[PDB]
Design a protein around this nucleic acid. Structure first.
Ligand SMILES: [Cl-]
Ligand SMILES: [Cl-]
Ligand SMILES: [Cl-]
Ligand SMILES: [Cl-]
Ligand SMILES: [Mn+2]
Ligand code: NA
Ligand code: NA
Ligand code: NA
Length: 326
DNA sequence: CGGCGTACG
DNA sequence: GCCG
């Protein structure tokens, strides 16, 4: 088992779901306390289990697996022996974990803001609503729409949203294309939002595109919230039978020269991308982001025409999006 | 022990 | 928390 998640296929569904979910609780809890290192180790250990070809049934099966030391192995041992891990259950029922989870799930609220509200004594969404003086416009929108934004986005929602985005994109710039990215491109059947990547086959024609797209969506009455650029974090009005619901949508524009990097970067998973960038820098001495891949010795950028090109330049076997579910 | 991804709004 |  390779040490980096980008070196191994990780399918969406797997054979160690319960074990990985427990480790991901501890990762999330570490993040709420600002312990980025422990979050990463627990996320990586969870991801290793997702990549295994069969269920872990005995502690000896963890020997030799990367990212399993004393702590992660003890979590698994307790789950195998008793069905429950006391540390995980203690986190789950803790006031700190439940409130930080509630607050950070709000669009416009991160760990730092959640933590400050927690320390101020705030615990519920209504606590936040009964004091709007302390909220940004973004947080007001996230709180107003919180119920709808907590409802899973379904694949039927995605097709409808893609059609309306293409319509606006086609008026803003004929020839521009819209590509579905994020978790739905990895095969997820649900999500918390929908992610689209927009480009144009003629390098440079995409400049200035996103304001033009946004103005046209807003004129069609489809935008419940937008910041107003190359990235837009929107709340869309999605028609439903006899009504509608708010849905988070991310729109990102890239020039066609950068499209493979942006596609790779926005297709995820989040852990896969961090591991890929870590691998690139630490193992290959190359600097990767969603714009390109830089050789800092030669001071040159790798021209890629495909995601396949990028994996080859990094010396990695190609993984389709469905195997990037780290 | 140092490192832990790397951007944009 | 774990790796190198
Ligand atoms: Cl840490
Ligand atoms: Cl409507
Ligand atoms: Cl591609
Ligand atoms: Cl980036
Ligand atoms: Mn998104
Ligand atoms: Na948030
Ligand atoms: Na997404
Ligand atoms: Na980091």
């Amino acid at each position: 088992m390779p040490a980096y998640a980008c070196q191994r296929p990780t399918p969406l569904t797997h054979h160690n779901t319960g074990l990985s979910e427990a480790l991901e609780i501890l990762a999330e809890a570490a993040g709420f306390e600002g312990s980025e290192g422990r979050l990463l180790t627990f996320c990586r250990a969870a991801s290793v289990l997702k990549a295994l070809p069969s269920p872990v049934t005995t502690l000896s099966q963890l020997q030799g697996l990367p990212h399993f030391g004393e702590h992660s192995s003890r979590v698994v041992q307790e789950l195998l022996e008793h069905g429950v891990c006391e540390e995980v259950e203690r986190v789950r029922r803790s006031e700190r974990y439940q409130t930080m989870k509630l607050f950070t799930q709000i669009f416009g609220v991160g760990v730092k803001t959640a933590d400050r509200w927690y320390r101020e004594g705030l615990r519920t969404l209504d606590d936040l609503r009964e004091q709007p003086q302390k909220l940004t416009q973004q947080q007001k929108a996230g709180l107003q729409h919180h119920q709808d934004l907590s409802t899973p986005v379904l694949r039927s929602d995605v097709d409808a949203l893609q059609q309306v985005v293409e319509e606006a994109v086609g008026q803003a710039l004929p020839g521009a294309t819209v590509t579905l990215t994020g978790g739905f491109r990895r095969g997820k059947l649900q999500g918390h939002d929908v992610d689209f990547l927009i480009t144009h086959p003629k390098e440079g024609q995409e400049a200035g595109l996103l304001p033009r797209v946004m103005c046209r969506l807003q004129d069609q009455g489809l935008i419940l919230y937008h910041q107003h650029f190359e990235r837009s974090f929107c709340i869309f009005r999605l028609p439903q039978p006899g009504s509608w619901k708010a849905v988070r949508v991310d729109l990102v524009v890239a020039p066609v020269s950068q499209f493979p990097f942006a596609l790779l970067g926005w297709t995820g998973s989040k852990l896969f991308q961090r591991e890929l960038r870590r691998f690139s820098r630490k193992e290959k001495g190359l600097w990767l982001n969603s714009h390109g891949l830089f050789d800092p010795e030669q001071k040159t950028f790798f021209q890629a025409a495909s995601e396949e090109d990028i994996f080859r330049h990094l010396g990695l076997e190609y993984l389709p999006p469905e195997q990037r579910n780290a």
